[PDB]
Amino acid sequence: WMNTLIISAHRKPIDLKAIGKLPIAMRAVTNYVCLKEAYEEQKKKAADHPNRTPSIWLAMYRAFGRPILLSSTFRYLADLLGFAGPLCISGIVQRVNESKEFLENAHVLAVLLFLALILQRTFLQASYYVTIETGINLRGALLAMIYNKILRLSTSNLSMGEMTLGQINNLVAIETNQLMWFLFLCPNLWAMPVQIIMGVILLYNLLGSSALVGAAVIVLLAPIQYFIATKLAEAQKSTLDYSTERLKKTNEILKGIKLLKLYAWEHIFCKSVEETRMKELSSLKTFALYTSLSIFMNAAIPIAAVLATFVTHAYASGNNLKPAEAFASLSLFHILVTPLFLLSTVVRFAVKAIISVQKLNEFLLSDEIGDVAIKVTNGYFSWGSGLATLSNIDIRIPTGQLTMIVGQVGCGKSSLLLAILGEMQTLEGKVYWNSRYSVAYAAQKPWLLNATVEENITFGSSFNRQRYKAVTDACSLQPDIDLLPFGDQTEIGERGINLSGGQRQRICVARALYQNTNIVFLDDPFSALDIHLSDHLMQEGILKFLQDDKRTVVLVTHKLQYLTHADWIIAMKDGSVLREGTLKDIQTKDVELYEHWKTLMNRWKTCWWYLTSGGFFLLFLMIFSKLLKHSVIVAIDYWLATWTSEYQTFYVAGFSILCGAGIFLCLVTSLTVEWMGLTAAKNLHHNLLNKIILGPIRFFDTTPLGLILNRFSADTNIIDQHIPPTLESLTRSTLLCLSAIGMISYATPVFLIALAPLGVAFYFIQKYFRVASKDLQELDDSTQLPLLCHFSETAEGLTTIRAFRHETRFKQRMLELTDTNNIAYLFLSAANRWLEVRTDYLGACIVLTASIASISSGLVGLGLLYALTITNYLNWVVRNLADLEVQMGAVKKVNSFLTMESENYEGTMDPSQVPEHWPQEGEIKIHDLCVRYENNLKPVLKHVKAYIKPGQKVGICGRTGSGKSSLSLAFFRMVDIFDGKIVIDGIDISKLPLHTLRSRLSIILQDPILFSGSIRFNLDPECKCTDDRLWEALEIAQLKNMVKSLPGGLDATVTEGGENFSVGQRQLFCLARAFVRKSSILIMDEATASIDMATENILQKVVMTAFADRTVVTIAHRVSSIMDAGLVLVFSEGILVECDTGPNLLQHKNGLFSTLVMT
Ligand SMILES: CC(C)CCC[C@@H](C)[C@H]1CC[C@H]2[C@@H]3CC=C4C[C@@H](OC(=O)CCC(=O)O)CC[C@]4(C)[C@H]3CC[C@]12C
Ligand SMILES: Nc1ncnc2c1ncn2[C@@H]1O[C@H](COP(=O)(O)OP(=O)(O)OP(=O)(O)O)[C@@H](O)[C@H]1O
Ligand SMILES: Nc1ncnc2c1ncn2[C@@H]1O[C@H](COP(=O)(O)OP(=O)(O)O)[C@@H](O)[C@H]1O
Ligand SMILES: CCC(C)(C)/N=C(\NC#N)Nc1cccnc1
Ligand SMILES: [Mg+2]
């Protein structure tokens, strides 16, 4: 059925429309239902038997076994028909050398052998088809299971450090695929034992008791292999672990690369990554050594068994083997060797699949979530640690009114929102929803999908243009969407163009405002926005747009100024509600709280590269040693054939030495390919990481994180664990096939003729496959990436998926995507099997031609002996060549990144001319600075001239987009400085090597970036600082008491992204990280964006007292903060409108500073 599609590949590239829809019984829906029923039946037995964990294996079996039984039936028939070549060759040799007389005609037996071979190949391929069908069905079912699990796991699992979003991505990408491949190969595990045993029985029939000796030597494969497997298992587990850890670090390095670079710590984190990589490579080396030992055993136990059998026969049966007995025995030994070719692969994949299924079982047994709109009574909600973060929560969110939940950093605002939404463990009390009706949740950390602006804003609703315009204008996104490549259809989020923090937060708030649900939980919508955007959003989006619909709005804001427009105020302190009521009620009951609020408001070449990565000697050793090994093997076969055909101590001794050489060469050839693979993997990963780290920040901003992290994650896996086995099998099969053809052509010269036409045939089929395959390959890739993406974007932002209660829609989307990917992979496998079947028929034609040529004298028998195995090893050559082409494509992907640009770290000034303490006085002097982020972009900064005196506190304030951050980054030479000079303390910063300009200046970015590890690791990765310095910095940052009360102490774990602390606490950790460095110039960029007014006030006072001598330049979120500063530089569209003292610019009425101050 494929033939037509393959030939159509030329005229019309095969697309998903040329490809058909998946059958009814192959859809992910039905397979998922079946597997879920089986897994739940296994679960039922967990309660009956103590510690009886549900086994994914028995569920898989109950759901998809019978197809595997049919496949194994086909494989058994394939083996029984494969035990026909022995008889046919024996009869051919008997008759050529010389009603049961018609049958002995060598030509009749040649025809029968051809028929038996084609039938055997047909049955083997039928087994393969059934198995790949079952394996694809099972991959679909398991993806659906893990997805419906992701939609139920508790957020505490990711927040408390149990698992990582990266681990789930890894599950989906790698581990299910490995299980699928093992299932593809699984029938061998019970078809190879049967075949080898049956062949040993027939060897007993032919030779006699002698065969039993060989039989014993064959059975030793079973213990040995088992042992090997165990060790491999261990190694693999270790590998996995380290890999995970390493990737975690890599991921973080790629997300926080801007902070690492600005702090000059890039190399330290890179070195930690490299150490974890060294551990992973040690694990992989153990794995590879045991793989090579596996290959040695599988290839040498045949040789030793042959030696033992035939020497035992030489010294047991005085009667010599007649030529027919000899060739029958040698042919049976070849039939035994054939299954042992793939034994290494099956044991390897079975071990890896056992490990992957352990991981999948663990993940499928993880923790899962359990006029007043919402009335909470006596709630003690906790965040999974058994320690109540909210205690005695008594709240009432009145229907159709505005509830503002206000408190200082870490008072349970987001915690209370997620408690009402039910994402955190309940310990007492109840939440009454006058059974959660869908609530539109704007999370503190905005979560954007990979779709367009429009798709993110609508988010599962019909496009009502009136509502869309109203929302997009209330959020003030309209001036921002048009500047994008495509107005509203531009791709947002990861795998698309990256918006600024304010833009993304406003997309999130627009999404929340658009959905037609009765309740809207907005969590800190006014953090990234400046005063103008926030005020517009409040005055239109919340006070007007959401009050026309009478929707119940719950606002989590640090902006006390907006409290005057609130109907209900919930004041939070230390996880409890101090006071709940109207402004007047709080004024009467809690006088001091109202007074405090008032005070606060102041009121291929890739293949050659891979082979030669090992120094040009491992390639030579591999190829030469393999050639000599196979020379010895052919010599052994010829020795047996001739010695037994002609019919002594001489013969025994010669055969013994040949077999010993064969075993030694087996060892030598086994080690080479694995050593090559290890060397290449090490070199490739080292180069990739080094070149990524040293890249310019522009490269990271322009390119999606997806591509780089995909390289590191899943291309290194291919280079490590998939290229070496494929290459080894390719080389062995190709040598076997070339040697066969050579032996046949030397025995029967005329065979050369048949070789050329058939060769042509081979060529053509390759050609056709190699076009169609590629097309289908692309489809596979193009279908698989969205799928993974979906998983990712549902794992991250799960609270939003389950706050809007759009779980069903997302489940259906996943089902659709997995069905499409399954169609793609099914037809890729179909092209593969088309090629394999055509090559099998080509091989059968070779067997027939060689047979007929030989029939019309021991050399010509050996010719047929090899003709038989041509059929198997040609198939293997072709399959492995295709796989190797794909994996060399992966190698190409890795090698592509080695031509990136590098930041010019060298610099011009000799390090001697740079004083030991360069920023001593800390006197910045900007002269006519012009700055554009990338080449050929309008100058974000134009003609900036300012002179900051030593110890002159400077404020910078302007509308969002005035390039204040561009100056902040210009001090560190990240934005390209076309013209002008920033002379800091006597040295032009353009000359200094970057690691002296980045190292001696400290910046606090608005976005908090916390790296996984201890608090100590995030405050100083170098571990130089004394504990007292860390405590000093934490006290300045107003986080000393919380860390004192943290369990671990100053070693308390900080889960990935600092998710176990509130956003404000993350920002304060960043402030402390900047404070430890004790540099002389401190550029704080909106450092108090997420910090409430009280903590902001006290922290500003303390940071000003402690860093009085240093020069601090603060880009102010509130212009009120920098009113008391010696110098104030107000930017407006890249130009400094005025540069004077605070009081002077304030005195001049109708000025930009005075305007901002008045507002
Ligand atoms: C030698 C002839 C007769 C058959 C060739 C293959 C067989 C020897 C069978 C019998 C024992 C089987 C092996 C014994 C058990 C394992 C370990 C298994 O991994 C584990 O058991 C997990 C590791 C652990 O036990 O801790 C992977 C399959 C494998 C290699 C089996 C693969 C197929 C084997 C080698
Ligand atoms: N995802 C989380 N998992 C576990 N514990 C958390 C998580 N988020 C916060 N906490 C804990 O909750 C305590 C209170 O933080 P909370 O989540 O209420 O912050 P918030 O007040 O909403 O944030 P902000 O300071 O931005 O207003 C913090 O001490 C932190 O230990
Ligand atoms: N990573 C970037 N790459 C290229 N251009 C940028 C980048 N970030 C900001 N810009 C541009 O620079 C201008 C000012 O941005 P920014 O420096 O963030 O202002 P702010 O003072 O609000 O930080 C914007 O109008 C935007 O077009
Ligand atoms: C049985 C082991 C000896 C060395 C006696 N013979 C082999 N070993 C292999 N491989 N013969 C062979 C040749 C070509 C293709 N397949 C098998
Ligand atoms: Mg909050």
Ligand SMILES: [Mg+2]
């Ligand atoms: Mg900014």
